[PDB]
Amino acid sequence: ASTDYWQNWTDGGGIVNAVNGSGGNYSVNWSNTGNFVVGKGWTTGSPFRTINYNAGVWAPNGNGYLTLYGWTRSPLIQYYVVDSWGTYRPTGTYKGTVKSDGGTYDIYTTTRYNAPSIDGDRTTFTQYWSVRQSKRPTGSNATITFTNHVNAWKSHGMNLGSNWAYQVMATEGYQSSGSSNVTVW
Numbered sequence: 001a002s003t004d005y006w007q008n009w010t011d012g013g014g015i016v017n018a019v020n021g022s023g024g025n026y027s028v029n030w031s032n033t034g035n036f037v038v039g040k041g042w043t044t045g046s047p048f049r050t051i052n053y054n055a056g057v058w059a060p061n062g063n064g065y066l067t068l069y070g071w072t073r074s075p076l077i078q079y080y081v082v083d084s085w086g087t088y089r090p091t092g093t094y095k096g097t098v099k100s101d102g103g104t105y106d107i108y109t110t111t112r113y114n115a116p117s118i119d120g121d122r123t124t125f126t127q128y129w130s131v132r133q134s135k136r137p138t139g140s141n142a143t144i145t146f147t148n149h150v151n152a153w154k155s156h157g158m159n160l161g162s163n164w165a166y167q168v169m170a171t172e173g174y175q176s177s178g179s180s181n182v183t184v185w
């Protein structure tokens with residue numbers, strides 16, 4: 001399935017110059033930002049999708065994540081599979097680990113309160129994370145075998161919602177500057 005979804009969200013802080021490139025390609029150049037999320041992927045997420053990407057540029061200066069990023073409803077859950085980051089490795093309530101695609105990821109949960117989501121500007125929701133224990137090398141074709149994460153989460157009592165929303169390979173930033181260039185398929 002070729003990508004069909006363009007995610008381009010900013011809370012309005014700083015500069016987020018995002019380019020919707022040809023096919024699965026996008027880029028972001030950002031400066032002194034609030035929170036933003038830019039990426040490409042699919043209108044409807046699947047627990048069985050293999051996400052492929054190649055980050056030809058991964059150059060955060062401060063907090064950025066290079067991450068699978070997506071949502072379900074029923075219930076409302078945000079999830080991440082974080083392959084690389086900048087100055088900050090995201091963590092939460094430690095649940096366990098999962099091995100996938102040549103890496104080991106820690107599994108965490110967090111909760112957001114009064115926060116933006118696909119449902120509104122001020123919402124409360126759980127987040128599920130796989131965060132790689134070390135930054136993944138970038139520049140070569142990489143795979144996220146999402147089933148492995150979903151199954152590990154499930155085994156730790158972290159069940160996703162029944163109603164799948166979008167699923168993207170994203171650049172998320174907070175209080176940072178940077179450059180990224182990623183192709184997704």
Ligand SMILES: O[C@@H]1[C@@H](O)[C@H](O[C@@H]2CO[C@@H](O[C@@H]3CO[C@@H](O)[C@H](O)[C@H]3O)[C@H](O)[C@H]2O)OC[C@H]1O
Nearest residue numbers: 024025053054055056057141181182183184185
């Ligand atoms: O940042 C940019 C990189 O993402 C880009 O890398 C290329 C991304 O596309 C890859 O081609 C895929 C190979 O596998 C096939 O099954 C897919 O259908 C193709 O799309 C290619 O191999 C990568 O080199 O390079 C340019 C950077 O700016």
Ligand SMILES: O[C@@H]1[C@@H](O)[C@H](O[C@@H]2CO[C@@H](O[C@@H]3CO[C@@H](O)[C@H](O)[C@H]3O)[C@H](O)[C@H]2O)OC[C@H]1O
Nearest residue numbers: 009035036037078112115116117118119120172
């Ligand atoms: O049109 C609607 C959009 O406005 C809506 O935007 C979402 C807003 O919330 C964003 O998620 C936050 C940023 O990412 C993480 O840091 C946080 O946990 C979230 O608070 C999300 O990226 C946007 O998609 O999406 C739905 C549309 O109907």
Ligand SMILES: [Zn+2]
Nearest residue numbers: 096097152155
């Ligand atoms: Zn386990």
